[PDB]
UniProtKB/Swiss-Prot annotation:
Effect of substituting residue 49 to R: Loss of kinase activity
PTM sites of type Phosphotyrosine: 299
GO cellular component, one term: nuclear speck
Organism listed in the record: Homo sapiens (Human)
Regulation: Activated by cell stresses such as DNA damage, heat shock, osmotic shock, anisomycin and sodium arsenite, as well as pro-inflammatory stimuli such as bacterial lipopolysaccharide (LPS) and interleukin-1.
Lineage: Eukaryota, Metazoa, Chordata, Craniata, Vertebrata
Effect ascribed to mutating residue 313 to R: Loss of kinase activity
Protein name stated in the entry: Mitogen-activated protein kinase 14
Binding-site residues for ATP, renumbered to this chain: 27-34, 49
Cofactor dependence: Mg(2+)
Length: 327
């Protein structure tokens, strides 16, 4: 049973949506565009997204497929997930338009200190989601407060500025790792605790100079891992500063919070607490339940390596729209 659609003009496009999605009102840009709407079937407010030029080129088509595969996979309280995907077409031939439905979102996390219990609860939920995302072998790569939607009773989702980027990710470094997301978290936690941006770098070189000011220049165990002779030269061509005490930088913070930050904001990704080890840190003792912290089903990313024609990506996408199960 196909629903009944109606057609409607919004954001200088024509939209064709199942009748269960009522009064669409645009929210906003240059990507595919989003309308907020009312879902009558579930009673909820939803973000409907019209993908623009979904199959315009090959890169375009593969981008669409990636987005659908991703959302379709995320089945977890703290991560954003897919409520619905649909198309007007009746065959593959007539297939051109892909609309996605997810929870409409109250408040992302841009903004004044928070209480140490609020930070605990906020960071716990971010970590809960990262353990899940990480166990499907996915790296978020760009965590920052505006990817963090919280709602009225403070329940938080990860949605998909260089202020929160891991330095291995800024300096293109191959010695990356899932824990780039973790560096980001430290940068958010610190921001919530103090009220101020931990590294408000004005530009690329500033950014790294600020980071090296807090953590110190790389030890010896870290130099052993830099391959480029010039990179090595250049790193120790820099001002040789020591590591600062965090208790001094995080004055009047819970010493467990301070401890945790010292395990997250480390230059060497191989020595950085993982999401799962962080959920066990004493700092979250009030919230940690080791049976309420689920990992994901394994996630086939093999399509990433592939080079295919527009009509193969489109066909693959259609298969995924056909097969969608509502939650």
């Amino acid at each position: 049973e196909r629903p009944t659609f109606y057609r409607q003009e919004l954001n200088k496009t024509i939209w064709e949506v199942p009748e269960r999605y009522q009064n669409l009102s645009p929210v906003g840009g240059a990507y595919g565009s989003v309308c907020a709407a009312f879902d009558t079937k579930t009673g909820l407010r939803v973000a409907v997204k019209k993908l623009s030029r979904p199959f315009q080129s090959i890169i375009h088509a593969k981008r669409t497929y990636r987005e659908l595969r991703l959302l379709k996979h995320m089945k977890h309280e703290n991560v954003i997930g897919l409520l619905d995907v649909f198309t007007p077409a009746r065959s593959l031939e007539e297939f051109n338009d892909v609309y996605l439905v997810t929870h409409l979102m109250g408040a992302d996390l841009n903004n004044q200190k928070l209480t140490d219990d609020h930070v605990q609860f906020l960071i716990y939920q971010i970590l809960r989601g990262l353990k899940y995302i990480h166990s499907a072998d996915i790296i978020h790569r760009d965590l920052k407060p505006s990817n963090l939607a919280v709602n009225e009773d403070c329940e938080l989702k990860i949605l998909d500025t260089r202020w929160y980027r891991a330095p291995e990710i800024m300096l293109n470094w191959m010695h990356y790792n899932q824990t780039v997301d973790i560096w980001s978290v430290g940068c958010i936690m610190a921001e919530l605790l103090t009220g101020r941006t931990l590294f408000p770098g004005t530009d690329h070189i500033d950014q790294l100079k600020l980071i090296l000011r807090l953590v110190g220049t790389p030890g010896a165990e870290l130099l052993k891992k830099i391959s480029s002779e010039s990179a090595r030269n250049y790193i120790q061509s820099l001002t040789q500063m020591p590591k600062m005490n965090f208790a001094n930088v995080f004055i009047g913070a819970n010493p467990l919070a301070v401890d945790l930050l010292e395990k997250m904001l480390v230059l060497d990704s191989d020595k950085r607490i993982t999401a799962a080890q962080a959920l066990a840190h004493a700092y979250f003792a009030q919230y940690h339940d080791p049976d309420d912290e689920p990992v994901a089903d394994p996630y086939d990313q093999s399509f990433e390596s592939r080079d295919l024609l527009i009509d193969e990506w489109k066909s693959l996408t259609y298969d995924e729209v056909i097969s969608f199960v509502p939650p």
